[PDB]
Amino acid sequence: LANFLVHSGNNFGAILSSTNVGSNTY
Amino acid sequence: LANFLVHSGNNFGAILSSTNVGSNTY
Amino acid sequence: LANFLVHSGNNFGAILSSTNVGSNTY
Amino acid sequence: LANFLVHSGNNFGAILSSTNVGSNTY
Amino acid sequence: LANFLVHSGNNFGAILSSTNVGSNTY
Amino acid sequence: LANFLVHSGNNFGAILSSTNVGSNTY
Amino acid sequence: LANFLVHSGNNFGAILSSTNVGSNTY
Amino acid sequence: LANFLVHSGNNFGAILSSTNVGSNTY
Amino acid sequence: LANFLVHSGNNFGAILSSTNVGSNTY
Amino acid sequence: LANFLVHSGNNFGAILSSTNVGSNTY
């Protein structure tokens, strides 16, 4: 069906794919 | 069907794809 | 059908694609 | 059918594509 | 069905895939 | 000032109050 | 100031209050 | 200032309050 | 300042308060 | 400042407070 499959009744969480997240604190 | 598949009844979470997120704190 | 597929009954979450998000705090 | 597909019954969330979002706080 | 499958009743946790997360503290 | 207060610079998200949302799929 | 306060620069997410959301799948 | 306070630069997530969410799958 | 305080640069996660979430699978 | 304080640069996780979550599987 798919390479990735998320099946839920209620969903509240984030879903990231091919993302670049970065944090810099000075 | 797809490379990525999200199937839910109620959805409340963010869905990111090929995104660049960045935070800088000074 | 698609490379990405979001199937829901009620949707409330944001859907980002190829987006650049940035925050700077001084 | 498409590269990205969003199928819902009721939709309330934002859908961004190729967008640049930025916030600066002084 | 899929290479990865997440089946739940209520979901609250993040789901990352092919993501690069980084933090730098100075 | 108020029981609920939403203060933003740019707003794009829906704001619901005392609403009844329902979806039925057959 | 308020019982609930949401202060942001850019807002894209939904804000629900005293809402009843329901989904039925057959 | 408030009983609940959400302060961000960019916001993308849903904010629920006194909400009743329900899903039924047959 | 508040009883609950969420301070972030970029926010993507849901924020629930006094909510009742329920899922029934048959 | 607060009874509970969440301070982050980028946030992706759900934040629950005074919530009742329930799942029933038959």
Residue numbers in the entry:
A (entry chain H), B (entry chain F), C (entry chain D), D (entry chain B), E (entry chain J), F (entry chain A), ...: 12 to 37
Structure paper excerpt:
Human islet amyloid polypeptide (IAPP) is a 37-residue polypeptide hormone that is co-secreted with insulin from pancreatic β cells and plays an essential role in glycemic regulation. IAPP forms amyloid deposits in the pancreas of >90% of individuals with T2D.43–45 A single genetic mutation resulting in a serine to glycine substitution at residue 20 (IAPP-S20G) is associated with familial, early-onset T2D.46,47 Recently, cryo-EM structures of IAPP amyloid fibrils assembled in vitro for the wild-type (WT)48–50 sequence and IAPP-S20G48 have been determined, as well as those of patient-seeded WT IAPP. Here, we used cryo-EM to determine structures of amyloid fibrils at different times during in vitro fibrillation of a disease-related variant of human islet amyloid polypeptide (IAPP-S20G). Strikingly, the fibrils formed in the lag, growth, and plateau phases have different structures, with new forms appearing and others disappearing as fibrillation proceeds.
Based on these data, we selected three distinct time points to solve the fibril structures present to high resolution using cryo-EM: 3 weeks, representing the late lag phase, 6 weeks, representing the growth phase, and 22 weeks, representing the plateau phase. 2D classification of fibril segments from the cryo-EM images revealed that ~30% of the fibrils in the 3-week dataset display an ~21-nm crossover distance, which was not a major component in the 6- or 22-week datasets, consistent with the analysis of nsEM images. A single solvable fibril form representing ca. one third of all fibrillar IAPP-S20G imaged was present at 3 weeks. These fibrils yielded a 3.0 Å resolution cryo-EM map that contains a 2PF fibril core with a 21 nm crossover distance, into which an atomic model could be built for residues 12–37 of each subunit. Despite these differences, the 3-week IAPP-S20G and WT IAPP fibrils share some similarities: they have a similar crossover length (21 vs. 25 nm), have a conserved inter-subunit interface involving the major aggregation prone region of IAPP (residues 23–27), and share a similar backbone conformation across residues 15–28. The remaining 68% of fibrils at the 3-week time point have no discernible twist, and their structure(s) could not be solved by helical reconstruction. The balance of sub-unit folds underlying the different fibril structures also changes as assembly progresses, with the P-fold found in the earliest fibrils in the lag phase, followed by the L- and C-subunit types in the 6-week sample, with the L- and U-subunit folds dominating at 22-week time point.
